[PDB]
Amino acid sequence: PRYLKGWLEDVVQLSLRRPSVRASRQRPIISLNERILEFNKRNITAIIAEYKRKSPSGLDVERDPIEYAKFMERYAVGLSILTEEKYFNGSYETLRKIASSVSIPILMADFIVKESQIDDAYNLGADTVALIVKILTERELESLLEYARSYGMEPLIEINDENDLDIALRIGARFIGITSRDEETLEINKENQRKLISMIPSNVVKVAESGISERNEIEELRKLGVNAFLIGSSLMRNPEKIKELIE
Template sequence: MKGVLEKLANNSQTAIKDGVYDIRYANTKSQKNLVDVIKNNKHASLITEVKFSSPSLGNIREISDPVQIARQMVDGGASALSVLTQPYLFNGSPEYFTKVRKGVTIPLLMKDIVVDKIQIDAAQKLGADVVLLIQAIFDNKFAKDIDEFVSYAHKKNLLVLLESHTRQEFADSTKTSADILGINNRNLDTLEIDLATTQSILKDRNEKRIIVSESGIESPKDIQFLKKCGADAFLVGSSIMKSRDIKGLVSELVLAI
């Protein structure tokens, strides 16, 4: 895993040096708390992702108006949106995030490879409600004290989604004060996806916090399987971004439960 993670971490350092996160304005965040939204949703809680490229798939969708895409997702019933701000390998940008923030009112997750607090500062200024942290980034020493990062995000009035992939990473994530715990079904070393990752990690679940299953979700059956495994919400990106009917697919997945 370290080779891929190192590349992703280095990309973030490059983006920091390039001034990508030098945000000089302040957007207004959502009035909705994502944890409450998920707890009160009787259907599947989807965090749908606006991303045009990824390390595993390359170009996913021709770059177009992110707001139009976001509104289709909202119309389909998404509980929140994840918007990529990482420019390298993901074709994301803070500019896309700002456009989406001004175009929708539901909670937004700033999706990036966070290795420095300047990215958390950027998330606050962009109007994010939630920021992503990745357990393996800290375990592999590409960023320092995870507790310090979580605390810093909280001081900026941001919720933290802390993502893990292995049972050990998940166990470590439960020791933090992160608000939401994520399980990435994708192995960052091989880029292979296995939904059984969520099943394995949650086999003996005794965690009370919201748990989000991420990656590899394509159908209502996937949602139903992961729900039975113990997932409370679902982050879905590539399959929706590849779809010719974004609103229809989101609605289909939301109504799987």
């Protein structure tokens, strides 16, 4: 991994020791990025709803994950399942049960630093994974991207600054998450998010992440080229909000 400190250094060290799983996957990969493009062509707002019990940027929510996933299956373009344990209270077992229960694309979101976490995602039923440029070196990014693609997955490459974006383009990313939240400091800066979005080629599928709460923001960002929107805590607290954001 890259040189880090504080909680990111910790979570990376923890992730290096994440025990791998032995599970058999049940269904072919279904592409999240391709379904987003299809929603775009159908003029349907594409929201990726996140399931997460806890995070550094919110209070814990304890709700039925299957109920949540089945509700969101009617409206969301895909689901993101947090599986990091210490800071997000995630679990691989929640990923597996949700993936066994719904038929929309599933992104496994964690701090992926080793190949066996990609094996884990595949074996638990996820259709893709996130890779985070802030924590991975160029070499790790290219290797883990190639490995995920060898399973048929197209990872979401997560960026937060111009240097991160340059690397995502350097490694040939086709699917980029532009987060307004700096994972190290938790600062939300949407001016910077919009700047990075404006510098991404048209043929990359772009997901705006963090700080999305109003239909009007979705409309503005769509006009700026954003293809989909990742929304977590607001929907953990009030799942029905997704209905307003799509209409």
